[PDB]
Amino acid sequence: SKNVVIYADGVYDMLHLGHMKQLEQAKKLFENTTLIVGVTSDNETKLFKGQVVQTLEERTETLKHIRWVDEIISPCPWVVTPEFLEKYKIDYVAHDDIYAWLKRAGKFKATQRTEGVSTTDLIVRILKNYE
Amino acid sequence: SKNVVIYADGVYDMLHLGHMKQLEQAKKLFENTTLIVGVTSDNETKLFKGQVVQTLEERTETLKHIRWVDEIISPCPWVVTPEFLEKYKIDYVAHDDIYAWLKRAGKFKATQRTEGVSTTDLIVRILKNYE
């Protein structure tokens, strides 16, 4: 029906099939969507999450090539606020509590986390050929 | 103007920014294109190229998520033939000789190879934090 604005955020470090399937899921929550993807800054990722392998510019440039991604906010705020949802006219936030206010507003949509061949799975698979 | 059919083939093992930018380049050779991507079989890749880390199904499923990819032939033939170009109505083959017949026919379009953060670059970068 009318176009629905979906917001998903994350680090998207070392993007793999799992992230890709999660972005696809967010994109297909309704039949007509705009999927906005937020990419966290390097410093806030290091402060709150721990290490980050790829810079903001590399993580964002990679997400650009992904079919489901309609718009990117890079860097994105670390914490979603109601003012943020209003400013970008976001209808739903896709994630896989601190998010209780989103559920209270009907704006929380869960995606799944799926398995991908992560970078770690690739290395393990290559190395297993050597004991 | 009229829609132009572009064919690009490869292994697309451990897809990274470099492959992505090359697929983007192929897709944007003309203003209206259909980009067909051929994905080589596991056995022929092992025979002719050497090892392959990801299976055909994993390499193909990853390419599916890439914005520039309009169609995928998986597995694709290892050698492009004129009969293949006719059967799929391919106007141009994008690559980065054995391809002399393609240039003679005006069907050869070069893309670039660019740098991406390959899996090897990622590992090196992570490990450099330890001597």
Ordered by start, the domain boundaries in chain B are: 1-131
Q: Which residues contact A112 (CB under 8 A, 6 or more apart)?
A: A21, A22, A25, A96
* Calpha distance B101→B81 (Å, rounded): 10
CB distance B66–A68 less than 8 Å? no
Q: Is there a contact between B7 and B89 (Cβ–Cβ < 8 Å)?
A: no
* Calpha distance A66→B119 (Å, rounded): 18
Task: Measure A16 CA to nearest chain B CA, in Å.
Answer: 8
Residues of chain A positioned with their CB less than 8 A from the CB of B120: none
SS3 call for B63:
helix
Known binding positions of B for phosphocholine: 11, 49
- Ramachandran area for residue A14 (φ above 0: left; ψ -120 to 50: alpha; else beta): left
Find the CB nearest B58 among A14, A117, A119.
Answer: A117
* Calpha distance B117→A119 (Å, rounded): 12
- What CA–CA distances, in Å, run from A97 to A26, A101, B7, B42? 21, 8, 49, 46
SS3 call for B117:
coil
CB distance B20–A62 less than 8 Å? yes
Nearest CA in chain B to A55: B117
The DSSP secondary structure of chain A, one letter per residue, reads: ---EEEEEEE--TT--HHHHHHHHHHHTSSSSEEEEEEEE-HHHHHHHT---SS-HHHHHHHHHTBTT--EEEEEEPSS--HHHHHHTT--EEEE--TTHHHHHTT-EEE--------HHHHHHHHHGGG-
* Calpha distance A2→B33 (Å, rounded): 29
* Calpha distance A60→A74 (Å, rounded): 7
Residues of chain B positioned with their CB less than 8 A from the CB of A119: 119, 122-123
- Exposed / middle / buried, residue B93 (Cβ in 10 Å: 0-12, 13-18, 19+): buried
Find the CB nearest B122 among A53, A69, A126.
Answer: A53
Give, rounded to a whole angstrom, the gap between the first and last alpha carbons of chain A.
Answer: 55
Residues of chain B positioned with their CB less than 8 A from the CB of A54: 117, 122
CB distance B17–A117 less than 8 Å? no
* Calpha distance A65→A58 (Å, rounded): 12
Return the number of other C-beta atoms located less than 10 Å from residue A101's C-beta: 13
CB distance A17–B68 less than 8 Å? no
Technique used to solve these coordinates: X-ray
Give the helix ranges, DSSP H, for chain B.
Answer: 17-27, 42-48, 56-64, 82-87, 100-104, 119-127
Using only C-alpha atoms, what is the Rg of chain B? Answer: 16
Task: Measure A80 CA to nearest chain B CA, in Å.
Answer: 27
